[PDB]
Every structure is written in C-alpha cells, then in structure tokens.
Design an enzyme around this catalytic site. Structure first.
Site, short mmCIF file in Angstrom:
data_model
loop_
_atom_site.label_atom_id
_atom_site.label_comp_id
_atom_site.label_asym_id
_atom_site.label_seq_id
_atom_site.Cartn_x
_atom_site.Cartn_y
_atom_site.Cartn_z
N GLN A 312 0.89 -1.15 0.00
CA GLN A 312 0.00 0.00 0.00
C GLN A 312 0.92 1.20 0.00
O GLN A 312 2.01 1.13 0.57
CB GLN A 312 -0.91 0.04 1.23
CG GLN A 312 -1.19 -1.29 1.93
CD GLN A 312 -1.95 -2.28 1.07
OE1 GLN A 312 -1.44 -3.34 0.74
NE2 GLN A 312 -3.17 -1.92 0.71
N1 LIG Z 1 -7.14 -13.82 -11.92
C1 LIG Z 1 -6.06 -13.78 -11.11
N2 LIG Z 1 -6.17 -13.22 -9.88
C2 LIG Z 1 -5.12 -13.16 -9.02
C3 LIG Z 1 -3.83 -13.71 -9.46
N3 LIG Z 1 -2.96 -13.51 -8.45
C4 LIG Z 1 -3.63 -12.90 -7.45
N4 LIG Z 1 -4.92 -12.69 -7.79
C5 LIG Z 1 -5.96 -12.03 -6.95
O1 LIG Z 1 -5.53 -10.73 -6.56
C6 LIG Z 1 -5.88 -10.48 -5.20
C7 LIG Z 1 -4.67 -9.91 -4.51
O2 LIG Z 1 -3.72 -10.92 -4.21
P1 LIG Z 1 -2.71 -10.62 -2.99
O3 LIG Z 1 -1.69 -11.71 -2.83
O4 LIG Z 1 -3.47 -10.43 -1.70
O5 LIG Z 1 -1.97 -9.28 -3.44
P2 LIG Z 1 -0.82 -8.59 -2.56
O6 LIG Z 1 -1.39 -7.41 -1.83
O7 LIG Z 1 0.27 -8.11 -3.48
O8 LIG Z 1 -0.25 -9.56 -1.56
C8 LIG Z 1 -6.34 -11.80 -4.59
O9 LIG Z 1 -7.71 -11.69 -4.20
C9 LIG Z 1 -6.22 -12.83 -5.68
O10 LIG Z 1 -7.44 -13.59 -5.79
C10 LIG Z 1 -3.78 -14.30 -10.82
O11 LIG Z 1 -2.73 -14.78 -11.27
N5 LIG Z 1 -4.90 -14.30 -11.56
#
Ligand SMILES: Nc1nc2c(ncn2[C@@H]2O[C@H](COP(=O)(O)OP(=O)(O)O)[C@@H](O)[C@H]2O)c(=O)[nH]1
Ligand SMILES: [Ca+2]
Ligand SMILES: [Mg+2]
Ligand SMILES: [Zn+2]
Length: 419
Positions: A312
């Site tokens: 963030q």
């Molecule tokens: N369609 C799709 N969604 C994804 C992929 N990777 C993550 N997401 C979605 O993006 C959201 C964020 O993932 P997250 O690991 O929490 O992001 P972070 O804040 O960088 O750790 C999650 O709800 C996942 O369902 C992907 O390869 N494909």
C-alpha cells in the site's frame, strides 16, 4: 493535508459508517471506480474480481488525491446499494455480516458486482441519454447494473442522421456537477479510445471547452494526436474553436543452497497469493497484508526465505529495511492493471537502483495472465523500462497465481541464475 478533509467527508456519507457488502464497523477500503466503502474482509474479494470490476484503495493506508475521490464523495454505500441491492429482502437475506464465513462472503460479493443478481431490473437506449443530461448518476448506475455496455452507441433526438456513443455525449453536456458521471463512465464501460466521424472523446472535450473533462480523460491515460476525417488532433480542434484553457493541458500531455528472497510489488499484485500457493500447493483466499509475510519454500533442494511485504502506498517506505542481505528480488506485477503500470515501473526502478541492492537477481512475475485484457510479458518488459537495463540480471516470467502456472518456472530461473 488538503485531502484529510475529503477523506473525512467521504466517511460521513450516508451508509458509509458500515461496509457496503457486510455492514461492518466503519470501513476504510474504497472501491474507487464505484465510490463505495468496504471492510478489510470484503475488500479482499474485490481485489479478487480484478481492476476490471473494482479498484481498491485504503483511506487509511493508500495515498489518495482529490481526483481519485470524485465518485466516493458523490456515491457512498446507501446510494449505491439502493440500486445494487434493490431486490434484497430484510429477513434471510444472502447479504452477510461482520464476521461471516469467507465462502459465504465471496459467493455473495461475486454474485452482486459481477453477475448483478440483486440489482434493480429493466432494459434501454434513450433513458440513458436522458439520465446523462439530467446528470442522474444513480440512473446511469442503474443502466450499468442491468448490463448496458457503454461501448456501443445510442441514437439521438430529432433528425438523427449521425450516432454518438455514451461517453462522447457525457463530455459534450458536462459541467462541475456533471463530472462524477464522466468519471464513472470512463472507469466502468468506457472504451476510452473509441472513434465512431472518427473523433475521439478527447477531441470533443476541446470543441465544447470542457477543461475538467480533459483532466479526467488523461488521468485515465488517453491517446493524444489521433486524427479524424478532418485530419485534426486534440490540439488542433482547440485552436479552430479557439478554446484557450484546454490547450495548456494538451501541451503538457507529452511530458546447502539457501537463498533470501524479497517479494515486492504494488498492492493487490498477488504477492501473498504467489507466496502461499507455492508453500501450500493449493490456492488460498487473501485479505490485504497490512504487515508482511515470511514463509520458506523448498523447491528442488533449495531453501527460499521469501519476504512478502505489503505494498500500500503508505507501507512501501518500509521496503528499504528488507533490502540488506537480499539476493533475489521478486517483483510481482498485476498485468490486468494497465492503469498502474508506470507506478510499478517507478517503484521497481526505485528498488533496483537502491545502493543497497546492486547484487540482486531480479525476477519479475507478469502476474494475472488469466484475466481478459491481460497485457503480455513482452509488453511488460518494454513498459517496465527493461529495454535499457544492462549490467543487471532481470527476467520477466508469465504467471497466474490462482492456477499456479508459471510460478515454479520462476524459481527454476532463480536457482539457475544464482551462479
Ligand atoms: N485472476 C487472477 N487473480 C489473481 C492472481 N494472483 C492474485 N490474484 C488475486 O488478486 C488479489 C490480490 O492478491 P494478494 O496476494 O493479496 O496481493 P498482494 O497485496 O500483493 O499480496 C487476490 O484476491 C487474488 O485472488 C492471478 O494470477 N490471476
Ligand atoms: Ca496507489
Ligand atoms: Mg501482500
Ligand atoms: Zn464487509
């Protein structure tokens, strides 16, 4: 400082002292393209739906400008749900509460925002045109909820020899009050670079002297210098009708075997998602990670000490702390997020140029390849500005964390390039 006030005003809207989807204690997470407020728990599902449907920022944790808070101040939960939860009863309602089962929450939010089950029902060409000039945002939302598709054009009033598409109109007939609809349209069904005598929505803004509309159009990052039937660019029309103020913004529109891994990237990129699919083998649901995560992946006789740090806007200046003694860098990039690519460009370049980071292997995960308009890995190399990166060891890897595709291959590259 100037925004502190606007944040405070966003929260005080009707219904905003409860989550949009489960009515929880005063929510801090904004779906910027819908102007609604969700708790951290509902928040994560929106992030799952993709930037295509929802763009989450924290009021508490992300850095927000007056421009991003337009719909937020002009929408809010009650107004929104009035449309979107219209056919929801009081008793036995599928809508959940504070601490409900993730499965139940997920199943509901996906049906609500993507499928539009609970939204008020009807068709309809002209009523939209009427709502736009009426500046009735709520009716425009109704249209959007019934599946209108702003991409295709509508017939107009008397002697309708030509035909104009939704966004083109909204710009023509816009003022201060007309703004949020312009913004909603762009972020929600707006084929921004559409043409139809081949005039772009950008052109029109210069013809009718719509300064604040020009602001919103370039915020969404639009095509400049595209030519129509007259062979006129956005700059050109602004001169022919001699509309002074617009031309100022159009001129600026140009310019044994262990290894410690730090896994960064912008918010919602899939950092946590990648980490845990790799560690558990099965895909898991994810809340935004407010701190950081550490797990050890043991793929092919090599220990990976992965440090997943949340991204963030406010919690990025903490990344510096995790630099010391790092060997491999995993920069996760959300590829469906075409809007925030130069943001990832900057934040990566801010890392790899840290004086405490030279001897780093860089693996870029070009994540979320499964999503519709995805933006391919070769397109990522160029945009992330890796053309002129020499005397640095980078490698863009196509991936899809939900399925698992591409992930182990990335590790394989780390193993190999840890020479
Ligand atoms: N369609 C799709 N969604 C994804 C992929 N990777 C993550 N997401 C979605 O993006 C959201 C964020 O993932 P997250 O690991 O929490 O992001 P972070 O804040 O960088 O750790 C999650 O709800 C996942 O369902 C992907 O390869 N494909
Ligand atoms: Ca941001
Ligand atoms: Mg995370
Ligand atoms: Zn909630």
């Amino acid at each position: 400082d100037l925004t502190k006030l606007l944040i405070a005003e966003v929260k005080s809207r009707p219904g905003n002292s409860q989550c949009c989807d489960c009515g929880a204690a005063d929510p801090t997470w904004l779906s910027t393209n819908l102007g609604v407020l969700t708790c951290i728990q509902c928040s994560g599902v929106h992030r799952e739906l993709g930037v295509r449907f929802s763009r989450m920022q924290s009021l508490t944790l992300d850095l927000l400008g007056p421009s991003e808070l337009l719909l937020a101040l002009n929408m809010g939960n009650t107004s929104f749900n009035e449309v979107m939860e219209a056919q929801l009863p009081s008793h036995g309602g599928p809508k959940p509460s504070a601490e409900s089962d993730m499965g139940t929450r997920r199943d509901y939010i996906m049906a609500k925002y993507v499928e539009h089950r609970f939204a008020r029902r009807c068709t309809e060409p002209q009523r939209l045109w009427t709502a736009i000039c009426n500046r009735d945002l709520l009716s425009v939302l109704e249209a959007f909820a019934n599946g209108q598709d702003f991409g295709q054009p509508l017939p107009g009033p008397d002697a309708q020899a030509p035909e104009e598409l939704v966004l083109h109109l909204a710009v023509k007939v816009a003022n201060q009050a007309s703004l949020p609809l312009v913004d909603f349209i762009i972020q929600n069904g707006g084929h921004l670079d559409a043409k139809a005598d081949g005039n772009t929505a950008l052109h029109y803004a210069a013809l009718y002297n719509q300064p604040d509309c020009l602001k919103l159009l370039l915020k969404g990052r639009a095509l400049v210098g595209t030519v129509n039937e007259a062979g006129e660019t956005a700059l050109d029309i602004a001169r022919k009708k001699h509309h002074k103020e617009c031309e100022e913004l159009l001129e600026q529109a140009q310019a044994n075997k262990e290894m410690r891994i730090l896994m960064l990237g912008l918010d919602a990129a899939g950092k946590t998602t990648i980490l845990y699919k790799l560690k558990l083998g099965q895909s898991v649901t994810t809340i935004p990670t407010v701190g950081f995560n550490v797990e050890t992946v043991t793929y092919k006789n090599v220990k990976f000490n992965v440090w997943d740090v949340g991204g963030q806007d406010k919690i990025r200046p903490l990344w510096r702390h995790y630099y010391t003694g790092t060997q491999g860098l995993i920069f996760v990039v959300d590829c469906a997020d075409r809007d925030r690519i130069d943001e990832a460009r900057q934040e990566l370049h801010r890392i790899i140029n840290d004086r405490e980071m030279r001897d780093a292997i860089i693996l870029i995960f070009a994540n979320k390849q499964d999503l519709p308009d995805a933006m391919k890995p070769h397109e990522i190399q160029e945009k992330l500005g890796l053309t002129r990166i020499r005397d640095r060891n980078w490698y863009v890897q196509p991936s899809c964390a939900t399925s698992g595709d591409g992930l182990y291959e990335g590790l394989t590259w780390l193993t190999s390039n840890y020479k």
